[PDB]
Structure 1
Amino acid sequence: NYIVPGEYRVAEGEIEINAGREKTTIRVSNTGDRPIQVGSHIHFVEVNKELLFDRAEGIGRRLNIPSGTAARFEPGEEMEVELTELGGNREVFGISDLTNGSVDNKELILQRAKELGYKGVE
């Protein structure tokens, strides 16, 4: 009976994000001396050079976390994160200028990443 003006009465159940997309777990380390925080929708291969991980596993992917959230890496911190696949046209432009086109061009993306010193290209 108590009235909270404008209150919600939410339905039962839960919301599954990024449903039907392949998920991938990888380990990532901040090798730098200042904190790095990574948003939900940045093309994962294009993050800060001083994050160390298998860069190939970030291609065409982003963090599998709620839209508008982030993963924070303190200096020296290693964490396991889960990635999901990019959707739509699966193209990335700008950001770190590693892709500028289809994410399918893995060899080109990695060549650029390696030349520019993004850590973790094999």
Structure 2
Amino acid sequence: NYIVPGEYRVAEGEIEINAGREKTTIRVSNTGDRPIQVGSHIHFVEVNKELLFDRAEGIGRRLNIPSGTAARFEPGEEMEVELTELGGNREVFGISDLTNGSVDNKELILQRAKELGYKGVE
């Protein structure tokens, strides 16, 4: 019965994030000489050009990490990341201007990605 003012008593268990959405694991490599850190909610295909990965696999997806956290890529670093599906209307506007509409238009997204030099358009 020591009193900590305003303390929590959290209930038992765990919180599952992004429940019921498809998950995907891909390899990603920072081919640049400066660090890149990627947030939980950026449309993954639209991340920095010097990150190399299967760009098709990033379409309509984002990192499967707690909201507000990030994945860090040191210069030259290759690692696996897990992706989850975008929700809501599944539309993306702005960012890198690769989508600007439905995420379903994978052909057009990839064509823009290739022309602008985003690495890993296979």
Shift of 1:23: 0.2
Shift of 1:83: 0.2
Residue aligned with 2:115, SS = helix
- Structure 1 counterpart of 2:30: 30
Cα deviation 1:31-79 (Å, max 9, x = unaligned): 0000000000000000000000000000000000000000000000001
Shift of 1:85: 0.2
Residue aligned with 1:72, SS = strand
Residue aligned with 1:38, SS = strand
- Structure 2 counterpart of 1:7: 7
- Structure 1 counterpart of 2:98: 98
The alignment yields a C-alpha RMSD, in angstroms, of: 0.2
- Structure 2 counterpart of 1:57: 57
2: CA distance, partners of 1:3 / 1:101: 54
TM-score computed with the length of structure 2 as normaliser: 1.00
Shift of 1:101: 0.3
Aligned identity (percent) is 100
Q: Which runs of 5 or more residues in structure 2 are unaligned? A: none
2: CA distance, partners of 1:64 / 1:44: 11
1: CA distance, partners of 2:94 / 2:3: 49
Shift of 1:115: 0.2
1: CA distance, partners of 2:35 / 2:79: 13
2: CA distance, partners of 1:58 / 1:68: 19
Segments of 4+ moved more than 2 angstroms: none
Q: Which runs of 5 or more residues in structure 1 are unaligned? A: none
Shift of 1:92: 0.2
